[PDB]
Amino acid sequence: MEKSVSVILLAGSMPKQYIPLLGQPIALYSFFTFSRMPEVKEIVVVCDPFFRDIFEEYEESIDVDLSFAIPGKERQDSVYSGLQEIDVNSELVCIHDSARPLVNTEDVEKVLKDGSAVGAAVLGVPAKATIKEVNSDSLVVKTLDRKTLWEMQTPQVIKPELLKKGFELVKSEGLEVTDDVSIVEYLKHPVYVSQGSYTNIKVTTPDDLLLAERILS
Amino acid sequence: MEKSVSVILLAGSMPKQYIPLLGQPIALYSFFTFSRMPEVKEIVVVCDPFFRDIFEEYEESIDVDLSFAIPGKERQDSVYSGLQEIDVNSELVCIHDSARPLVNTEDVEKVLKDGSAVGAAVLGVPAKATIKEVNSDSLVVKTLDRKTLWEMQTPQVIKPELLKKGFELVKSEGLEVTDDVSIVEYLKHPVYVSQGSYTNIKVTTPDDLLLAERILS
Numbered sequence: 001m002e003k004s005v006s007v008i009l010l011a012g013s014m015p016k017q018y019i020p021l022l023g024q025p026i027a028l029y030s031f032f033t034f035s036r037m038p039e040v041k042e043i044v045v046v047c048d049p050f051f052r053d054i055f056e057e058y059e060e061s062i063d064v065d066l067s068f069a070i071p072g073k074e075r076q077d078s079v080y081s082g083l084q085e086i087d088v089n090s091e092l093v094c095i096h097d098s099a100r101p102l103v104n105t106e107d108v109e110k111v112l113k114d115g116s117a118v119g120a121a122v123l124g125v126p127a128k129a130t131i132k133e134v135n136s137d138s139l140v141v142k143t144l145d146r147k148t149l150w151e152m153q154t155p156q157v158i159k160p161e162l163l164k165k166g167f168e169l170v171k172s173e174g175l176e177v178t179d180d181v182s183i184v185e186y187l188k189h190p191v192y193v194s195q196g197s198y199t200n201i202k203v204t205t206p207d208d209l210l211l212a213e214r215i216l217s
Numbered sequence: 218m219e220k221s222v223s224v225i226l227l228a229g230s231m232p233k234q235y236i237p238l239l240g241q242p243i244a245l246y247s248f249f250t251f252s253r254m255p256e257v258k259e260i261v262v263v264c265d266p267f268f269r270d271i272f273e274e275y276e277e278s279i280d281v282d283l284s285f286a287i288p289g290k291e292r293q294d295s296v297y298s299g300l301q302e303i304d305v306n307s308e309l310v311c312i313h314d315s316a317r318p319l320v321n322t323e324d325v326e327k328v329l330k331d332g333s334a335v336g337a338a339v340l341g342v343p344a345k346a347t348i349k350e351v352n353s354d355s356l357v358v359k360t361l362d363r364k365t366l367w368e369m370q371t372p373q374v375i376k377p378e379l380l381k382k383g384f385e386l387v388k389s390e391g392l393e394v395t396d397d398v399s400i401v402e403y404l405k406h407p408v409y410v411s412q413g414s415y416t417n418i419k420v421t422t423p424d425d426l427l428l429a430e431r432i433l434s
C-alpha cells in the first residue's frame with residue numbers, strides 16, 4: 001500500500017486554482033495533502049508550463065516524485081495526458097481537481113481503500129436539493145420511491161488498467177463524454193461511492209474563496 | 218390574470234430567513250417582489266406568530282391582502298396550513314421559500330404562466346455538478362445517455378385543486394413525502410420546469426448571506 005498510488009492533480013485575473021487562500025495558492029493545499037500520505041508515490045500535475053514553478057519550488061521538501069503533463073482541451077483530455085505520465089506499476093490512480101483544496105486526508109484514505117477494493121471509487125455527498133431529470137418537453141420525469149442522489153466530488157480513484165480500457169473504448173467507438181464519470185459508465189465494472197464531506201467544495205466563483213477561508217478556520 | 222394568484226410564503230441567533238440583507242430581513246425581499254406583481258392578490262405568510270409583525274408593518278403599503286397561517290412540523294405541513302387560507306377562487310397558488318430572497322420578477326412571471334398553462338410548474342436550473350443515483354451497495358447507478366438533471370428552486374406554482382387532490386391522496390394512502398415534489402409525483406398530471414436563474418439561491422448557511430449581498434450589487 002505504501003507508494004502504490006499516483007495522483008493526477010488537475011490544475012489546467014489568475015485562474016481560480018492559483019489564487020491564494022491564507023497566502024497559499026489553492027492548488028497547493030491538495031498537493032500537500034497528497035504529498036504527506038505514505039500511500040502516494042507521485043503527483044503528476046497537469047498544468048500550463050507557466051505555473052510549473054508553483055509546485056517545483058517544493059519539490060525537494062515533499063516525499064513524492066513530482067511530474068508534469070500538458071493540459072488538454074477538455075477535462076478528460078487532461079486526465080489522459082496525466083495518465084500517460086504515471087509510474088508503470090502504480091496500483092491506483094487518484095485524480096483530483098486542484099480547485100478542491102479542502103479535501104481531508106481521512107476522506108482521501110477512504111476513497112483510496114474503496115478504489116483498491118472495488119477497482120473504481122469516487123468521493124460523494126448526498127445532494128441536499130431536490131433534483132430531477134427533465135425531459136425534452138420540459139417536464140419532470142417522476143419517480144415514486146424516496147430516491148438517493150449523490151453529488152460527486154474528487155478524488156476519483158481507479159486502477160489504471162481499467163481507466164486505460166475506458167479511454168480505449170471511448171476513442172475506438174467515438175463515444176460522448178458529458179460528465180465526470182461518463183468513461184466508467186461505459187464499462188461493466190462497478191464504481192463505488194465513498195462518503196465524503198460537505199466541506200470538500202470546488203472553488204469556482206470568487207464567493208467560494210471566502211467560504212474556503214471560513215472553513216480553514 | 219390580474220389578482221388571480223395566491224402566494225404561500227414559507228417563513229417558518231435569528232432564523233436565517235429573518236436575518237437582514239442590507240438592513241432588510243431576508244423574508245421581506247421575496248414578499249415585496251410578489252406584492253408588486255399585479256397577478257398576485259394575496260400572500261399567506263406561514264410563520265411563527267412572533268414574526269408576524271415583520272410583515273404586518275407593511276400591510277397598508279402593499280397591494281395585496283396579507284394573511285397568516287401557522288407552520289407545521291414538516292415543510293409539506295406548512296404548505297397545507299397555508300393552503301387552507303387562500304382565497305376560495307384563486308386560480309393558482311405560488312409556494313415560495315422565504316430563504317430565496319433574490320427571485321427575479323421576470324422568473325416569477327415565467328413560472329406563473331407555465332403553471333397556469335400546464336397546471337403545475339417549478340423554477341429549475343441545470344445542475345452543474347455530476348450527480349448520480351447510488352444503490353444500496355453504494356454503487357453508482359450508471360446511465361449511458363447524456364442526461365439532464367435540474368435543481369428545483371421556488372416558486373412552485375400549482376392549480377389549488379390539483380394540490381388539494383395531491384394532499385388527499387397522500388393522507389388517504391399514507392404515502393411518503395421525501396423531497397419538494399413528492400406530492401405531485403404521485404399524481405399523473407404533468408409538472409413543467411420553468412428555467413430560472415442561478416442567482417435564485419437559498420440562504421441556508423451564514424456564508425450564503427454574503428453571497429446574497431454580493432448578488433444584490
Ligand SMILES: N#Cc1cnn2c(O)c(Cc3ccccc3)c(Cl)nc12
Binds near residue numbers: 077095158163177
Ligand atoms: N473528465 C472526465 C471524465 C469523464 N469520465 N471520467 C471517468 O470515468 C473517470 C474515471 C473514474 C470515474 C469514477 C470513479 C473513479 C474513476 C475520470 Cl478520472 N474522469 C472522467
Ligand SMILES: N#Cc1cnn2c(O)c(Cc3ccccc3)c(Cl)nc12
Binds near residue numbers: 400
Ligand atoms: N414540502 C413539500 C412538498 C412535497 N411535495 N410537494 C409538492 O408536490 C408541491 C406542489 C408542486 C410541485 C411541483 C410544482 C408545483 C407544485 C409542493 Cl408546493 N410542496 C411539496
Ligand SMILES: [Cu+2]
Binds near residue numbers: 064065066
Ligand atoms: Cu522527482
Ligand SMILES: [Cu+2]
Binds near residue numbers: 065087
Ligand atoms: Cu519513482
Ligand SMILES: [Cu+2]
Binds near residue numbers: 202204205208
Ligand atoms: Cu460554490
Ligand SMILES: [Cu+2]
Binds near residue numbers: 281282283
Ligand atoms: Cu388584508
Ligand SMILES: [Cu+2]
Binds near residue numbers: 282304
Ligand atoms: Cu380579497
Ligand SMILES: [Cu+2]
Binds near residue numbers: 419421422425
Ligand atoms: Cu449555498
Ligand SMILES: [Mg+2]
Binds near residue numbers: 188189
Ligand atoms: Mg472488471
Ligand SMILES: [Mg+2]
Binds near residue numbers: 405406
Ligand atoms: Mg390532470
Ligand code: NA
Binds near residue numbers: 053
Ligand atoms: Na521558471
Ligand code: NA
Binds near residue numbers: 270
Ligand atoms: Na406585535
Ligand SMILES: [Zn+2]
Binds near residue numbers: 037038039109
Ligand atoms: Zn494511510
Ligand SMILES: [Zn+2]
Binds near residue numbers: 254255256326
Ligand atoms: Zn405581470
